[PDB]
Amino acid sequence: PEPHAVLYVTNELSHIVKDGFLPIWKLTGDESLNDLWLENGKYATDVYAYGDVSKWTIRQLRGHGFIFISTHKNVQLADIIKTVDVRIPREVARSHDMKAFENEIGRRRIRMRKGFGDALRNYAFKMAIEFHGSEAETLNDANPRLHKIYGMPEIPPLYMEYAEIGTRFDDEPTDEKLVSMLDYIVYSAEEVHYIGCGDLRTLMQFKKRSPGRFRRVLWHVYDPIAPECSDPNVIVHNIMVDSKKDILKHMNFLKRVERLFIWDVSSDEWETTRFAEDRLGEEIAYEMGGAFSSALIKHRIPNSKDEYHCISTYLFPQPGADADMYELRNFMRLRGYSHVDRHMHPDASVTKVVSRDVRKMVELYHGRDRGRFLKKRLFEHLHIVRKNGLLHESDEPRADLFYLTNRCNMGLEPSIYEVMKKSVIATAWVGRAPLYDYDDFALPRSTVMLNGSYRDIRILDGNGAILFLMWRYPDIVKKDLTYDPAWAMNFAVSLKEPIPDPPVPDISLCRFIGLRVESSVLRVRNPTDLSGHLYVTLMSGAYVTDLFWWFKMILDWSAQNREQKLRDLKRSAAEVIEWVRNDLIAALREYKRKMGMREGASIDSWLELLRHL
């Protein structure tokens, strides 16, 4: 809505910038500190800035809006030596297009989005069990035997009871049929009984592409033709499979396991055989359903047959499969032990299927340049538990990432806050820019600040949030991380997290960039200095900081002391950019003088903690 990034370019580059239409901030060794703060506070859009900054720490430079652009890998700082966020290929200096330069920034910037979420996401696994509004991306880093991952993901094209299909969606090529198969089924299995595993090149490329969940799985791969393979989590079976009893003899029942069953079996002039194998794969699983959480049965669709039968939970198309391939995969959710509570997915049963409706499935969805997004949906629908963050009641600590503020959730803001009252970590779109690739809606910052801040709940904009996590847990959030402060600052972020002792006014807390310009506007647009300060911070809706801590610091802390307040900074590894009970309550009062109604309790809640300090 206001917040910018300082687009810090290194020297060898400076001259192009000059030709832009964005402003250019110029340094110069001295400045002082409160020089930067008053300067930077001058820009309302992103800016380009260069010149010596050797003097300053990183957190200082992030608190400030800095993104690092050079042709060199990294730049010197006071703190340490930072990996350049945006490296230009020199050819693309150099050259000297102001634009293809600019476009170059944009993209890697957009790429940076994922470092931010990752930083947060990555705190959350360190602190959380439940996980709401989730997707492939979280599945990706979960330990399924710990985390429990929730959400309502968009549902892939499905056969069962049960039609609706399609409608069609746009897509993109992926890994080949059979690798892409593996890809979406392996999440939380532990033991895979892959039958008709072939020559293994499949599984082998999977291992070449997904080494973690390959190794955190024990494979029995059943097949006469299957080659010897060392891999000591890979047990090779040269048996052929007619009976379930060729799987029993390869199972530890004296110990608990999510077991997965995969049936990819076909032989060598009708193929009402092709059929019985499919059926027999199923028939085998069924009997065993009680050992396996699930099955993925191969399921060629007949020609000769018009409607027919099988045991299934689901039937669906499969990514990257040639468009003439009329072979759906069949899913079977089963009873039998598992880490993901798939109960939602109906206990795999006898399903009457209409070849034509299936045909139309393949026709719509197959194509060896069409899979990506299907595969995802398959992957999420299968492994995430279909639960709704807002409505869910949580015995265990919970994370609530980037889903609260979705446009489905409009009107349910109450429930939103109540969630950010009890979340380990969650976040909300505050950004008032006009505003693309992202489909959320914004909580008024003022409201966020006031509803959000509790003894136990810290309430910072994305950047602050980031900053904080560095400071406090430097190895969940490396200092040298790369991200976009400005993007970080479209977020409100909230953490089950005590105020520091001492309430040292660190940068994660105090940045208040542009508060000067922000105050003038206030007075020239909708009219009416520590009181003045806090009124503006709110009346503006340009900032999200944690009031409570801010309070506890302002009073219980400053003054305090020229000496014994730095000292307790030192000490608290903290840093800054800017070097009485009543004015605040007047602040408060005045504020809601302008807005009973559109707020605020609470307000009250706050006030009534000043003159009840």
Single-letter code of the amino acid located at 172: E
Name the residues that contact ligand M7G, by CB under 6 A. Answer: 300-303, 324-327, 359
Q: Does 140 bind ligand GUN (CB under 6 A)?
A: yes
> Nearer to ligand GUN by C-beta: 133 or 505?
133
Under 8 Å CB-to-CB from 317, ≥6 apart: which residues?
157, 328, 361, 362, 364, 365, 366, 374
Nearest residue relative to ligand M7G (C-beta): 326
Kindly tell me which residue out of 97, 102, 137, 246 binds ligand GUN, with binding defined by CB under 6 A. Answer: 137
Long-range pairs for 269-275: beta carbons < 8 A, 24 or more residues apart: 270/304, 271/300, 272/304, 274/300, 275/300, 275/302
- The single residue listed with the structure tokens 């910052």 is 445
- Residues in binding contact with ligand GUN, number by CB under 6 A: 13
Tokens representing 556 are 């219980």
State in angstroms the smallest separation of the CB of 148 from ligand GUN. Answer: 18
Q: Which of 55, 113, 360, 565 binds ligand GUN (CB under 6 A)?
A: 113
Spell out where 402-500 has E strands.
425-429, 457-461, 491-496
Contact 361, 370 (CB under 8 A): no
The tally of CA atoms less than 13 A away on the side-chain side of residue 289 is: 22
- Choose between 114 and 589: whose C-beta lies nearer to ligand GUN: 114
Q: Does 143 bind ligand GUN (CB under 6 A)?
A: no
Closer residue to ligand M7G (CB): 324 or 341: 324
Among ligand GUN, ligand M7G, none, residue 184 binds (CB under 5-8 Å by kind) = ligand GUN
CB closer to ligand M7G, 20 vs 198 = 198
3-state secondary structure 131-183: EECCCHHHHHHCCCCCCEEEECCCCCCCECCCCCCCCCCCCCCCCCHHHHHHH
Look at residue 82 and give the partner it binds from ligand GUN, ligand M7G, none, a contact being a CB closer than 5 to 8 Å depending on partner kind: none
**CB neighbour burial string for 339-359, b if at least 16 within 10 angstroms, e if fewer:** bbebeebeebeebebebeebe
Give the residue, chosen from 329, 376, 472, 511, that forms a contact with ligand GUN under the rule CB under 6 A: 376
**Paired strand residues for 496:** 457
Select 324 or 357, whichever has its Cβ closest to ligand M7G.
Answer: 324
Judged by CB, which is closer to ligand M7G: 327, or 518? 327
Residue nearer to ligand GUN on the CB measure, 184 or 326: 184
Residues 409-448 that bind ligand GUN (CB under 6 A): none
Closest separation in Å from C-beta 296 to ligand GUN: 12
Residue 216 in contact with ligand GUN, rule: CB under 6 A: no
> C-beta of 279: minimal distance to ligand M7G in Å?
15
Residue nearest to ligand GUN (CB): 117
Residues in the chain: 613
Give the neighbor-by-neighbor strand order of the sheet with 259-263: 234-237, 218-222, 191-195, 259-263, 292-300, 327-333, 314-316
Instruction: Locate 295 and state its tokens.
Output: 């099955």
Q: Which residues bind ligand GUN (CB under 6 A)?
A: 113-114, 116-117, 136-137, 140, 183-184, 375-376, 379, 402
